[PDB]
DNA sequence: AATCTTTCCCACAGT
DNA sequence: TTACTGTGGGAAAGA
């Protein structure tokens, strides 16, 4: 029940 | 010599909107010291002093003669209410200050508890003492399986979450998943507080996601939002953690200060994962004679607690008060009766006295105590706020305030809409 | 039976 | 450079 909006922060890798 | 609010007082403070509010962020629960122990609460209780009627109120105190020392709110944290240890709380120059050193011994009894904050100005003047929501004492966190029957220890879909980690069982090695300067770290000192979502298996990754209903179990697609910034990371699965191992097989209920481990849904086994102040994505090397473990990094490991805050808006209208601005009230939703005799307004909250009255902008209304959770009002004319309308014309927006006795605003940001 | 609650102690870092 | 003190986590004992 119920949307929601939230923008993605993509954690990195690593080289 | 206290005074009633005037019309002119109301009109006045709805040109300026300067309140001053007190804002709780804590725990819902606590583990318990025994031995001389001092097994501090983590995340550490923060204490913010929110908008403009404290700079407001600095002006003003300093205009009548104060220093800065003098117009410098102070506070002081404790719990409800032991033998008086009451830690002092450093707000010079701060917005915000974290309570670092409270704990809980096995001499206090009481199952539940609140923190009380103790506040006044520098001069000494009264402010209140504002308390948190119910805090939970716990012997230690839940070594076994957990059940729904005391879902006071369960993590509800949609409620908020500290995620922290330690390294090497010191507290000096507590960073807390955080988001500031757009983006997420490991912040030794500060902390955020995450909505935790379930989403179904079948949901796809994106911005807009359908949230489900229900308690967070492990192996669940879960995500994370800041409740302050607004942002997510990607879809996650929440796991059990043994040790330095991720259980993938574990289906049971996620409970309070059990230690996490956040899988990046569709990713080669990565992880979300500390690296000093970065948060990065660390790949687990699965388990040679299991296939349901996977061995991962020391910072993939998260101890997850449910957070709550507890907000206080207030306002001298009539100017400085003698009595404390506290227990304030709160208002938690607004309804009609509806649709009975005369337009009723139920308002539902608690802090609630027979000393409140009921105003819909600069107009007050007929108000009648129920009991400290609910008050009942009559919804004022609409020719109160617009000359001669024989009926509502096009909708009408009015803030539901409710004011005091000597003339202390407390401002619901709730409002009141007239339509035909 | 299996849980929670209390006690106990070592690790690893401040004094 | 040590010995003294103190959180915190795990496991063990007791409720």
Redesign the pocket.
């Known amino acids: 029940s119920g949307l929601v909006k939230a923008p993605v922060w993509w954690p990195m890798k690593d080289n | 010599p206290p005074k009633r609010l005037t019309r002119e007082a109301m009109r006045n403070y709805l040109k300026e909107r300067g309140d001053q509010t007190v804002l709780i962020l804590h725990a819902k629960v606590a583990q318990?010291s025994?031995?001389?122990?001092?097994?501090?609460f983590?995340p550490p209780p923060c204490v913010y002093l929110m908008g403009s009627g404290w700079k407001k109120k600095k002006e003003q105190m300093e205009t009548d003669g104060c220093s800065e020392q003098e117009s410098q709110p102070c506070a002081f944290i404790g719990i409800g209410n032991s033998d008086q240890e009451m830690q002092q709380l450093n707000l010079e120059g701060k917005n915000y200050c974290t309570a670092k050193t409270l704990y809980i011994s096995?001499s206090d009894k009481r199952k539940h508890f609140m923190l009380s904050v103790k506040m006044f100005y520098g001069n000494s003047d009264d402010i209140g003492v504002f308390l948190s929501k119910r805090i939970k004492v716990?012997?230690?966190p839940?070594?076994?399986?957990?059940?729904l029957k005391?879902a006071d220890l369960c993590i509800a879909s949609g409620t908020k979450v500290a995620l922290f980690n330690?390294?090497?069982?010191?507290?000096?090695?507590?960073r807390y998943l955080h988001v500031e300067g757009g983006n997420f770290h490991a912040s030794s000192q500060q902390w955020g507080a995450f909505y935790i979502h379930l989403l179904d298996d079948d949901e796809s990754e994106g911005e807009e996601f359908t949230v489900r209903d229900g308690y967070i179990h492990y192996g669940q697609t879960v995500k994370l939002v800041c409740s302050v910034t607004g942002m997510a990371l990607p879809r996650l699965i929440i796991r059990k953690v043994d040790?330095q191992t991720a259980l993938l097989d574990a289906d049971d209920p996620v409970s309070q200060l059990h230690?996490c481990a956040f899988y990046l849904k569709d990713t080669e086994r990565m992880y979300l994962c500390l690296s000093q102040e970065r948060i990065i994505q660390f790949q687990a090397t699965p388990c040679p004679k299991e296939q349901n473990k996977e061995m991962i990094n020391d910072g993939a490991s998260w101890?997850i607690i449910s957070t709550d805050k507890a907000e206080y808006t207030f306002y001298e209208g009539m100017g400085p008060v003698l009595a404390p601005v506290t227990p304030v009230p709160v208002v938690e939703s607004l309804q009609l009766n509806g649709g009975g005799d005369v337009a009723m307004l139920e308002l539902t909250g608690q802090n609630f006295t027979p000393n409140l009255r009921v105003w819909f902008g600069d107009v007050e209304a007929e108000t009648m105590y129920r009991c400290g959770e609910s008050m009942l009002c009559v919804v004022p004319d609409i020719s109160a706020f617009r000359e001669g309308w024989r009926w509502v014309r096009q909708p009408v927006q009015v803030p539901v305030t409710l004011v005091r006795n000597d003339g202390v605003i407390y401002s619901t940001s709730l409002t009141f809409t007239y339509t035909p």
């Open positions: 318990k025994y031995g001389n122990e001092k097994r501090f983590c096995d716990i012997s230690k839940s070594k076994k399986k957990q059940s005391n330690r390294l090497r069982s010191q507290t000096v090695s507590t040790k230690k101890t």
